[PDB]
Symmetry: D3
C-alpha cells in the first residue's frame, strides 16, 4: 500500500490510528515510571488480516528499496513480538526464518537462536518497534556469535524521539529501517481532525522533549 | 500434501527425517534437563528455516484443520509462546483469520494479560503449537484463552508423541480435541521403510515407544 | 477439497451440512408452487463464507478439468442472479472470459440475452448454482447458441438428481451435466454423521426414491 | 495499476476506451426512455476481459482501503445482475463475505441473498451510477436486515448530474468511484484518436445534459 | 493434476492426447535420420496452453518433492531451447535459482556452457522436455559438474521407456531419472478412451515392445 | 517494484548494478572487436529469484501501460536468450507462449517457431537485451510468416547508444519497449558513489560516441 517512503509512512500511520494501536491521553498519562501521553501496541496488528497483509507488503517494499533484493539470506525475529512479522516477511521474501531468544537456553554458539542458521548467512532482524534500540544489542550479538552477518534491522514502528535510537545500532554497524515514526503518526492525526487541539499540542510537546515531559508529569 | 491422514502422516515423517529434525541415538540416549532418558529427539523449530518444507507443512495443516474440524468453525488462531507463533501466523494467513498468541505467564491487569492481540468475545479460537508430549502445558493456554471469552474446543500440533496414555484425555476432559499431522509411530514406520537406520537402533526406539517410563528408568537412567 | 469424484461429493456434502445450507424437516415439509418436500437447499448461502466458497471453487475447477478437459472451454457463462458469483470465480480460476445470461431478452439483436462479449465460435461452459429438472437450462443454452457460442457442457454445484429427465433433457440437445454432489451424497453423509434422527432420514430416503408420490401424500 | 487517485482514474478511462466500453457518437445520439446522449458506457463488457478485470479489481481494492479503511468493511453486497461479478471479485480480494440484493423482494432478509450477520458493515458494489436513485432501494434493503451501510463503490460515475452524490449523502452513504466522465473525456482528448467535433459535442453534453438531450430529441 | 504416480501419469497422458501433442499413424510412419516410428510427440506445444502447462507444473513440483525431496535441490538447469520454459516455471514454483546449459560451449572456462550464476557446491536439478535414450543428457550433466554443481537427479515431462539403456546410462554416472508419463501410459489411456482404432493401437504396442525391429521392418 | 517509467528504470538499473550484471572497466576494455568499457550479462538475472520476480512485475506493468491490457494474444521469446523472461511474462499475463528459433529447422510457415501459433494472433516479442535491434528483424519476419501480427517488442535492457536501435524496428512497424537504458544505469551508478570519477567519465564519453571510442581503444 505505497511506493515511496512518505506514502508508506502515511499509510502506516493511518493503519495504526485506524485499528487503535496508537492511543493519546494528555489528561491521564501512561505510566516502570516514564509517564507518557502516547501508547502504542503494535501486537494488535496481527489480529487484523488486511492490515497485516498491507503492512507486510510495505515491509517487503521497504526492504527491497532500502537494503536490496539479493542482500538478505535469512530473517530473524525478536523474542516474542517480532516473530509473526518475521515469519510473514520470510514467507514473502522466500528466505529461511529464525528467531532469537532473550536469554540463552543451553550451551554453545547456537543457544539463543532457534532454527537453522548457516555460517556466513546475511540475517535481517525484524521486530515490532524500537524506543532506544538498546534491546537490539543482545539479539545482534547473539546472531553474530553464531556466524551470521547482521547489518540491517527492520521494525514496524520507530519512536524517533530519542537521540541514540539510530546511533546505537550504527556503532555496531547495523542500519535501522522503519515503516513509520511518531512524527508521521502525529502529522496524520493532526490532518485527520479527529483529535482535540490540546491533546495534539501536549503530544507534540512530549515528542520534542520526552524526558522533560515525563519528569514533569509524574516520572 | 496427501489429502488423507495416512499420506499426510507419511509426508510429514519424511519431511522430519529429511531435514534431520528427528534424531535417533540408542547408544547415547538424550538425557534432558529433567533427567528423562529417551533415544529420540525432535526439534520442530528447525522446520521454519526451510521454505518448501514449511510451506508443505502449512498446506497439510490447513487440510487437516478443514477436514477434521471444518471450514467455518474457527474464528481466530492462537499460538503458544515462542515455539508455535510462526506456525500460528502461517495458519492464520492461510485461513484468513485473526491471529493472537498466548504468553506463558501473565503480564497485565487481567482478562487480557496472557493474550497479545485483539480477541473478540465469543470467538472460536484454534490453539496451534509445534508439538505436544503429555498435553498438560496446553491447559494453561486453553484456560487463558477461555478467560478472555474465547471458545476453545480444538488444538492443533504439528507433532504428537502419542506414547503417553493421557496425551489426549487430559485435553478431552476440558472439551478440547487434539489434532496432529504425524506421531512417533508414523516416523518410526517411515524410518523402518526407508532403511537408512540400523535394525538395533529402530528396535530400541520401538521398545522405548511401547514403554517410555521403563525405558527411561532402565536404559538411560531416571 | 478432494481429488477424486467420491471425495469431492463427500466434502461438498459436509460443506453443505456444516453451513446449514441443507435443511431436513419431515414433520413440516417445505411447501414451495405447491410442491411438498422434506428437503431444502440454498446454494446462495455458500457465497457468504470465504473458506467454504474457496474450497468449492477449487473442487469445481478440478471437476471441470477432469471431466471436460483443460483446454475445452473458452468462456464461462453464468445463469441469471444465482450462478453469477460462481461463474465469476470459476472464470477467474480458469483465466477465461466471463459472460452471464439474463432470464429474459433485453433487446432485439442476437446478443440480447447475453451481457458481455462473446466471440463467434467460442466454446462456453454454463455455470449455475443448482439444477432440479434442467428444464430451465434449455433457455440459457439456446440463448448462448443464438450468439454463436458452442455449448456442450453445463456445470452445477448441486445436482438434485431424483427426477429421471434431469440429464436426458440436456443430453437431447448435446449438453453434458456435471456436478459436485447430489442429494444421495448429502443423505449418505448425513446418515454417517449421526446428527439427524433415523425417522427424518428415512422420510428423506422415501422422498428421494419417490418424489411425486411423497409430494402428493404429504402435501400438494 | 496506479497508486494515486488521478492515476487510477486515468488508466481506468484508458481501460474503458481500449475495450470499447465507451462509445461516442454526436451525429446519431443514443436514444436510451428517450434521453438522447452522444456517450454510451457498457461496464458489463468489462467482465469478458481477464487482465482488464484483474486490474480494475486491484484498483477497486486500493481505492476501498485508501478512502474507506482497511478494517471498516465486513461484508460486500452487490446489486442485482449488474455488479454481482465485481462484488464477488472484491469480496474474494478483501477476504470478506459476499451478499447480493435483488431489485424486488421475494417473500427482513427477503431482498438479500446470502448470510448477513446483524450489525455487520456492508459495502455496496455496482457497475455504474447515473443519478444514484436506484441505490436508495438497495441501501434501505440492506439496512432493513440490520447491516450498516455507509459506503458505496461503483466502477464508473457519470458526475454530470448534480444529485448523483448528495442523494446518497442524505442517507449517510458515501460514493466511491474509480473514474468519471471527465477523466474519460480528458484521456480521449489527449489520445487524439477522436475527431475534434465529436469531443466538443461530448463536452457540451457533459456540461449540460438535460439541455443537450432536449435539443437533440428527448 | 494428480497426487500419486499413477494419477499423475494418467492425467499427463490425457493432457498430451487432448492437446494433440502425441500423434499416432501406422499407415504412414513418422520417418525422421530415418527411424520410422508410428508415434510422434511434440512437448514444445504444451507451452502454448496456459491451463495445460500450469497443471503440468503442479504435477512436476509434486513429483520432484515426492521422489527427490523438499530440500535436496538448490538450482534448476534447463537444456537447450527445449526444457528452458519448463525449468523456468519449475524454478519459480520451487523458489530456486535457475540456469540453462548450452548445447555447445561458447567461450573458455568452467562456466562456458552454463548461462547464469551457479554457486559452488549447489545441488542442481536438470530439467528437459523428453528423453529417448538419455544419451544427450550426459553432456549437460558433465557441463554442470564441470562448474562445481552436484547433479544427482534429472526431471523430464516425458520418458519414452522403450529402450533398455534409457535409465541405466544416467545411473552409471549417478543421475536418477524422474518422469511424469511414459509411452505405456499414453498407450493405455488411448486404449481406454476409445478414440483410436484397434489396428493403430496394436501397431503402436508392437512398436513399443520392439522399436528397433519395427523400424527395420518399416524403413530406416 | 515501481509505478512510473522513471521509477521502473531506476529500480532496474539498481537491480543490474546490485547483482553485478553490469560491469565497468575503462583501463582494460572488454574484447569480434568493438572494445567497450561496459559489459552486461542479462542472463545472470534468472539466477536470482527476487530480482527476476521484481523485473517480471515491472515488465508486466510496462506492457500493460504502454501497449495495453488486451492488445497481446501471445508472447514469443528469442532463442536461448529471452525464453525464460518470455515464459514468466506469459505466465503473468495468462497468455500462450511461443519461441522463435534463430535458424529454421524444417519447411513450411512454422519451421522457425516452436509452439502453437493461431492465425491472426497478436504476438509480443521478448528478448533479454538489444543493441542495434538488427537481430530482431529475423524473429519478427519469422513470426509474421506464420500469420502472427507483431507490432510490439519488449527487452529488459536497451543500449540506447546507437541511432538505429529503434528506427530499424519502426520501419517494419514494430515498437520497442524497454525497462532501462545505459543512460539510466550510468545515472544510478553516478548517484551511488561506489564508482570512481575517471571510470564514469570514460563510460560517459563512450556512451556518447561508441564507434569513435572503440576505434580509438583498439577495436
Amino acid at each position: 500500500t505505497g511506493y515511496d517512503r512518505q506514502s508508506i509512512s502515511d499509510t502506516t500511520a493511518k493503519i495504526l490510528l485506524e485499528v487503535q494501536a496508537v492511543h493519546f491521553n494528555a489528561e491521564k498519562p501512561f505510566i516502570s515510571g516514564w509517564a507518557s501521553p502516547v501508547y502504542i501496541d503494535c501486537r494488535k496488528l496481527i489480529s487484523y488480516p488486511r492490515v497485516r497483509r498491507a503492512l507486510m507488503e510495505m515491509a517487503e517494499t521497504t526492504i527491497t528499496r532500502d537494503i536490496g533484493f539479493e542482500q538478505i539470506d535469512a530473517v530473524a525475529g525478536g523474542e516474542t513480538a517480532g516473530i509473526p512479522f518475521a515469519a510473514w516477511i520470510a514467507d514473502r521474501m522466500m528466505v529461511p526464518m529464525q528467531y532469537v531468544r532473550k536469554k540463552p537456553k543451553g550451551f554453545g554458539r547456537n543457544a539463543q537462536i532457534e532454527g537453522h542458521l548457516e555460517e556466513g548467512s546475511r540475517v535481517l532482524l525484524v521486530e515490532d518497534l524500537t524506543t532506544d534500540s538498546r534491546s537490539k544489542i543482545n539479539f545482534v550479538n547473539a546472531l553474530r556469535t553464531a556466524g551470521a552477518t547482521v547489518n540491517h534491522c527492520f521494525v514496524l514502528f520507530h519512536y524517533n524521539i530519542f537521540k541514540e535510537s539510530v546511533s546505537v545500532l550504527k556503532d555496531i554497524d547495523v542500519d535501522l529501517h522503519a515503516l513509520a515514526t511518531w512524527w508521521d503518526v502525529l502529522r496524520v492525526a493532526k490532518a485527520s481532525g479527529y483529535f482535540e487541539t490540546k491533546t495534539l499540542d501536549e503530544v507534540e510537546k512530549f515528542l520534542h522533549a520526552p524526558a522533560e515531559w515525563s519528569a514533569a508529569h509524574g516520572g
